[PDB]
Design a protein around this nucleic acid. Structure first.
Length: 290
DNA sequence: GCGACACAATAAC
DNA sequence: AGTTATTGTGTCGC
């Protein structure tokens, strides 16, 4: 009924089929590590301004809620939240040096303003994009939005337990204790240590995330989860690391920039999950039906 | 099959 | 040692 796997940090992931077993909404059993991600490809090279050294980049993503491993499939529920977190790392550059440096795209050099992550959902069989929606904790009593592009600086990915612990914090004292895990406050650095051209100072806002945390995410309510044959559709979640540049023939999305003008999110690397099954609202997907 | 509202279990405090 | 928050899901009604 419950299959248990040990996570990297010693917590457990407890996989169960909601067709057979109903567990409380806030049970720790709802938190579990989802499918592993795989490299799709690398795109535009990034080099340091003077040294010319190529920046080695790696997305570090994890799903922490919403997916179960059931008979060799990864299964989510349309009605329910998932959590997808990601950082990135730069194997050949420590953070403190990285923030003081400047970087160009090798396309022919475009200056990188900042690094960012976005997520997408796709039909894994035909590459069609599928809309994602997010809620606040207030859900229907608050706004709905689509996942946004998240400026980030490189950081290790927090342990599964840390994401759990930080999922619904309001208390100021606890917020302070997790602050350094999730944010860099540029307004707190010594500005005298940085050149005008430094990467840190081309980030759009003073509060800079170290971790992209997409919580309370769902596939759009209008998604069809079955093919016409009644076979399950296969979906995939994608994480894309990009460099944002000033647009003043390679893969990129347009981006509503800080100063209002046109911006360019130039793809650097992309990872995705293996195929995912999503169970719809049908009564037969729930243990209540039995 | 979807938007909306309802209920209720365990976290958060 | 209480109250309020969050979220899986039951149900309504079109």
């Amino acid at each position: 009924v419950i299959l248990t796997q040990l996570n990297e940090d010693g917590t457990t992931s407890n996989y169960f089929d909601k067709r057979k077993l109903k567990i409380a909404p806030r049970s720790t059993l709802q938190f579990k590590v989802g499918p592993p991600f795989e490299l799709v490809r690398d795109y535009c090279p990034v080099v340091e301004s003077h040294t010319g050294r190529t920046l080695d980049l790696r997305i570090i993503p994890r799903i922490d809620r919403g997916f179960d491993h059931i008979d060799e499939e990864w299964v989510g529920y349309k009605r329910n939240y998932f959590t997808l977190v990601s950082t990135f790392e730069t194997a050949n550059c420590d953070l403190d040096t990285f923030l003081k440096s400047s970087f160009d795209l090798l396309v022919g050099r475009l200056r990188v303003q900042y690094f960012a992550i976005k997520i997408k959902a796709k039909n894994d069989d035909d590459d069609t994009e599928i809309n994602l929606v997010q809620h606040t904790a207030k859900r229907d009593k608050g706004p709905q939005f689509c996942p946004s592009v998240c400026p980030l600086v490189p950081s290790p990915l927090p342990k599964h337990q840390t994401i759990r612990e930080a999922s619904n914090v309001r208390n100021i004292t606890k917020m302070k204790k997790y602050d350094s895990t999730f944010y860099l406050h540029r307004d707190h650095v010594n500005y005298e240590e940085y050149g005008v051209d430094s990467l840190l100072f081309s980030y759009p806002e003073d509060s800079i995330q170290k971790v992209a945390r997409y919580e309370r995410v769902q596939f759009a309510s209008s998604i069809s989860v079955k093919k016409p044959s009644q076979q399950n559709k296969h979906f995939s979640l994608h994480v894309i690391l990009g460099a944002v540049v000033d647009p003043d023939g390679i893969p990129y999305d347009e981006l509503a920039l800080k100063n209002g003008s046109k911006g360019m999110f130039v793809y650097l690397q992309e990872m995705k999950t293996p195929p995912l099954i999503i169970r719809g609202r049908s009564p037969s997907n729930y243990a209540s039906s039995q």
